[PDB]
Amino acid sequence: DKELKFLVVDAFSTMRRIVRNLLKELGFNNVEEAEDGVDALNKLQAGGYGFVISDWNMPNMDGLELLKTIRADGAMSALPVLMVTAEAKKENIIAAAQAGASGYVVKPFTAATLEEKLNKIFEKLGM
């Protein structure tokens, strides 16, 4: 399972590299990157991914739109999706909860905070 394949979606390169190094630090070296929602969806179609980490607000297709699209796609309807945000607000959290987000994490975060979140979802998703 440390071989689970992650797709990290963020408009900003620096932010994608940060998330990538935190995963490596934790033992997950099978990570991939996407620049926006469309790029994410195109990549996911090829298959083989087992976890998606996405920022909430990307230019064009935003995290919430990406999520509702993954959830509706039969082939990828069960993919775990961690939402990343700068501002946690009851309004955004519930909306994401209702659309199917597996969880949310406020940035900036450390590998210890990310791991805590990963686990809770892994055990939630019984995987």
Domain of 96 in residue numbering reads as 1-127
Distance, first Cα to last Cα, the chain:
9
The answer to whether 28 and 50 have CB atoms below 8 angstroms apart is no
* Residue whose tokens read 């796609």: 73
- Which experimental approach was used here? X-ray
What is the DSSP-derived secondary structure letter of residue 89?
A: -
Output the CA–CA distances (angstroms, integers) from residue 76 to 45, 70, 83, in the order listed: 8, 6, 17
- Residue 94 CA to its chain's centroid (Å): 17
Residue 104, classed as helix, strand or coil, is strand
Residues in contact with 108: Cβ distance below 8 Å, sequence separation at least 6, in sequence order: none
Burial of residue 74, with CB atoms counted within 10 A of its CB: 0-12 exposed, 13-18 middle, 19 or more buried: exposed
* Residue whose tokens read 């805590």: 116
Residue 52's DSSP bridge partners are 7, 81
The backbone torsions φ and ψ at residue 46, rounded to the nearest 5 degrees and listed phi first, read -60, -20
| Residue type at position 100 | G
Residue 49's DSSP bridge partners are none
Residue-wise burial string across 77-89, b where 16 or more C-beta atoms lie within 10 A, e elsewhere:
eebbbbbbbeeee
Looking at the structure of the chain, the number of domains it has is 1
- CATH number for the domain spanning 6: value is 3.40.50.2300
